[PDB]
Amino acid sequence: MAKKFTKKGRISRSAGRFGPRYGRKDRKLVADLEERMRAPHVCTKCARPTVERIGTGIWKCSKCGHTFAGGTYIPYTSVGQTLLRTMKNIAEAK
């Protein structure tokens, strides 16, 4: 499907561009964060996966055109999720 994931070429992932440098821990952290960033995120108006990162904390929908501010590396954060959940439950209880 993607590039050759041979018997070896499978652990580094996107951190394979650093070669033999910076140690195992940092490379693993950067790699995992990169697979989270490259994910197919979902829109809020469209409800179609079209969201990609334009800048530091700026996101946009390719089809929908919608622009919004979010996380630096991921569109939606857990704390914002909790705020939405709590405020929406309070509103809906009224």
């Binding site: 964060l33 530091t56 501010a69 630096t72 954060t77 704390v79 914002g80 709590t86 309070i90």
Partner: protein
């Protein structure tokens, strides 16, 4: 006179320690509103601010003047903001902290009324309203302390955007170098024990050791408060 230290050089304000002000987009402050007024406005664009490494919003108000604003998370181009006393509680509006319910998150809080906002401004931080007495309200600051603010203070509801900025390690001197070009900080910094006895209280010797205790009292004169300034404790937790 053994040479002055880096802190005193920053005090003088030489060009090496001055912020490159012309790079920054604009100052962030709350809209100025007279007594018993409520102005609205809808976002026109979302923009990057080089002075904080976080997004900011451009909003055009009904009078005509547009202002950059500290962008809370979720702000999108098109939504209208209703800053004023009569605003409802929603993510984005600016309302007094006296009539904010307990448990709600806020940010860009002011010290005294009509300051524009001074607390809770870096990426992904937020504060909480705890209690509402008649004369004050206690909010838990992101540091972890309780602060007693005036009920007639303004603060945008939500949390500051850009959350998670420090989950990505530098892993190079080059990337951190590039960040420091748009700040007043100096990069890189020499360590005190590697200097000469003219330059620092810790310098000198045939081997690199502090020589004297690193904890310094709070009453030490300028040019000597180097190290652990008036520490209450030291070491990790055993």
């Amino acid at each position: 006179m053994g040479k002055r230290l880096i802190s005193q050089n920053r005090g003088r304000g030489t060009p090496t320690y001055r912020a490159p002000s012309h790079k920054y987009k604009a100052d962030l402050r709350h809209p100025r509103v007279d007594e018993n007024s409520s102005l609205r406005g809808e976002v026109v664009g979302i923009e990057h601010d080089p002075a904080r490494s976080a997004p900011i919003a451009k909003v055009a108000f009904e009078n005509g003047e547009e202002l950059f604003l500290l962008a809370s998370e979720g702000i999108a181009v098109g939504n209208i903001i209703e800053c004023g006393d009569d605003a409802e509680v929603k993510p984005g509006n600016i309302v007094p902290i006296g009539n904010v319910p307990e448990g709600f998150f806020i940010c860009n809080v002011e010290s005294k009324p009509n300051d524009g906002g001074k607390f809770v401004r870096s990426s992904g931080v937020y504060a909480t309203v705890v209690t509402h007495e008649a004369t004050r309200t206690a909010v838990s600051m992101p540091s972890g302390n309780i602060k007693w603010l005036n009920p007639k203070c303004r603060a945008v509801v939500g949390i500051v955007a850009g959350s998670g900025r420090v989950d990505r390690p530098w892993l190079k001197a080059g990337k951190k170098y590039h960040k420091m070009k748009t700040r007043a900080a100096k990069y890189p910094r020499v360590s005190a024990v590697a200097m000469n006895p003219r330059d620092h209280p810790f310098g000198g010797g045939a081997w690199k050791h502090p020589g004297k205790p690193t904890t310094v009292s709070r009453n030490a004169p300028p040019g000597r408060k180097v190290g652990l300034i008036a520490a209450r404790r030291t070491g990790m937790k055993r």
